[PDB]
């Protein structure tokens, strides 16, 4: 065949999205976790299966512990990756990595050992002729077909913020943020407790994962809403827990996302996301700042929260200079925004030169992710 | 303990004759390249006094 | 076609301005920079463009670092201004320098090097029938209409003084002064600090020195200006910045100017731009001195500010006999006068037979320049 | 008592350096910071207290949010500065300051409403007989006993270039650059990140300055140690963290210091600290040159590093005329430079007839500060 | 046990860097000699140049 597709891989934490390069959606997205059985099984003829991987992992969440292996764009677990990948690969797409080029996704300010050990993994576990490691922000840059913007992306893993000006990039001015869906999560299931609900355990903590996924918005004014939380209506919402338990979530919903605003909240001093975005905007050139304001692009599966798009324009637009307009552009399908550049980049004639061949990486070693691209 | 506060005698020796003989090698060093500067500049002089 | 038209640039430092000769304005006026990508662009199907060139440099200012490659009338980087010329011939006028003569101006007292180096690529890199380098204040003179007057010429590159009588001219009286357009911007953002605006980079370098075009005014009286400066009223202006950020100047923008006339400010001893003309007109003979006093021209870039002509004409006036009037003749429109003062002389019939043929220089050399011209 | 001794404090940013006049070292020297119980306390009997001024914030760091009121040479919160001499004159050298005239330092190029803003403190909020503001350079050079040198002074707060002959001062040859002890922190705790290490808030912030305090060191040739940081032995310190955390830092170490020679890393074109005093020195007169290559004076806090001084004579000599020899002279102790030409300069007969006296500032208002002073 | 082995490792540290010292320090000044005999040599071959 011409070509030979090429395959790309989207692992911030919490979610592998995978697919053929050349199309518009991913094939597979399921969750990034490796579930181990910790009790102890007693029948004959069962698995055994020592772990299982993906969505087949959330059927059978209750006897699982459930490990991610990615915390804050960082592997904790190298050989639980691996298993993902193999899962992405052989169960999924049905692929042989030695018929495709594979490109990989990876966040801002990451530490080196990531990517060079991930290359390590292509190239010397599933066979490979070519790869690529690419910055997140940019890849969503690519998916919303802007040649400008700041790049807000914030994943499950952690929140990392690229402006952009004309392609370039800006090295002092990226900003990465730990904040997360994962830390959202946790405060979550921390202020469901003043209610009586107790979730204590990993299987029932993607349970309040998915509440969060739906129910939980973010307020155009916080304190307003907090104040109309005293006549209990709309705010409150019935949600069914598999179980057949029923929660009733009211005030507690819309301020679990407002932690992205108030990291004080969590008990971090770092910054709320919309003065990280002024203190990226600040760090660039005066020149630029004007497309900045107005070409802000959010990507990530934790920008997904209805109004966070208004909130910031509303938060961005009262520090800003109000004598220049602020546009954010924030997609549907926002989420699956850095798969799409990844898919549009190997696509790309010209990127087909730009591969960390494994020719090159078996003379130069691992060492030479860093010495080709960013 | 004892033992401890001379591992920490010499620790701290370490890091005195470590910085000593990297500011020693950065001497020497210096030297090797204030001569290669003028292992240069005496050739150069050599070549335009010649 | 008859007569071929002819070709005229001018390139003192900061702007070329460039067009047909017979033609009563420029039609390509443009910034003097090259600007260089100074950041690495992460994207794939960018450019990738070594650097740019002309008013594509001011849009595309935060990126690049921006150099100037002509400072005080010399050109410091001789591909840098090949790069010039060569988008003035192709990226505006369109033509072909083989059908063309083309002037050039230069400024006075000027080294040999810039001459002869400035003919050597006229005729070794754009192919061209014939050329002819000029002297930029006797060109503005000619634009003006008048056969005596003492032309002040101060553009970007540095001020030049040349007193002319009936034609002829006076090469012991030339005076040139290192003060310019350039140095009053780096003035003007030294200036600014202590109201707590900082500047440091070369793409607002460029925003001061749009402020210095319109807000900047030449005072009536120093002193005088200073002193209302306590009461700050109409001596404010704000400023709009391409960041939303706002300036507001008062003293501090007229002050600026005023180091035209005070050179103690920037820390040089020489002479401010009256007492120079009166440097060049007393080393005149006693005998003309009478119309140059009556006839001064202004030419060049950094003569727009407002009350230049008026300060010239009491501190002359001032200095000077008050037995002889002392018009100061500065048109609107001086801007461009050496670039209209090169397309009359183009123009003209008899300087038709002036150029410096490329035969000329084929058999005789680079050197002919001083040879043949002034 | 006999002239009543004088008081004399530093504050550039980072540290007050603060004690009596006629003294060879200050008695107090503490870090300019003003920290704030973040969180909430529940207990009874605590405190209160609304802030922490000095080392007591130190002391109780991770509770409080830090916050420097000193930027870039400016005072970005008053009633934040206002507390730090309330702490330096009540709590350490428990002096009535109506019975001391006082001495402040103050970097050059800076805001007028710095100086302007700082007399009237000091006149009405802590009520004293005289003061007087002066330039951190000229006081490090009276230190070194020096009549001429060109002092690169470089805090905390910003860097600063002051050329001085015989005495005398060159204002347009005075450059300021926007680099600082600071800007390496920031560029230190990013550079850390690809290491694992991640350092997020301002208590830890403070860990990495004392980490770059001590173990970070200037590259004789930055390439040549690059290069041997290949084979990792003496370049990895190992460093212990208050938590009982082990850090281990390679060639990350000797880059942080490098960002003064490469302002690229940091991601601004102004150009590195050796250019900026050619940049200086170019702009002094011919004749003085020779002395001002061989007198170069370092000062202040951030130039403390080892190996500054060769790097900066081995790229000052490469740049400028071999012709001359290159003295640079940088005494140990130049961190106290600026106190200590503060503690002669109060000690000068002379200059006890030259502060600004409180019945003069009474009388003449605030803005008398730049008319008597420089 | 293994403190008094670390108390001869690191003494051991100390008598290689005393060593290594020695050598650095031996060579950073006899290569400031070929310094000063070069830069004194490029004096005097300036001075014939002269």
Redesign the interface.
Known sequence: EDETTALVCDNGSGLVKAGFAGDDAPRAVFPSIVGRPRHQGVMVGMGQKDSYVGDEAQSKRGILTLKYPIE?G?ITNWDDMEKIWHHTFYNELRVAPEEHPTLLTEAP?????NREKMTQIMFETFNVPAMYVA?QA?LSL?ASGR?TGIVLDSGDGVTHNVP??????????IM?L?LAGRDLTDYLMKILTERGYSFVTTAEREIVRDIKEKLCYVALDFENEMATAASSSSLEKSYELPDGQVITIGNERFRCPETLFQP?FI????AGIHETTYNSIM????????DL?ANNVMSGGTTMYPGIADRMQKEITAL??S??KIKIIAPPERKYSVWIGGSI?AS?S??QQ?WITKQEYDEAGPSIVHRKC? | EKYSQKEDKYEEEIKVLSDKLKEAETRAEFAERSVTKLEKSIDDLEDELY
Chains 1, 3, 4 share one sequence.
């Open positions: 804050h960082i300010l990451n530490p080196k050992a910055i940019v690519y040649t952009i000006y004309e392609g370039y990039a800006l090295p002092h001015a990465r730990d004080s008990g971090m001093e770092s760090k660039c050139d005066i020149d630029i700042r004007k304001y800003a200079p004598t220049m980049l790309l010209t990127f730009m960013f």
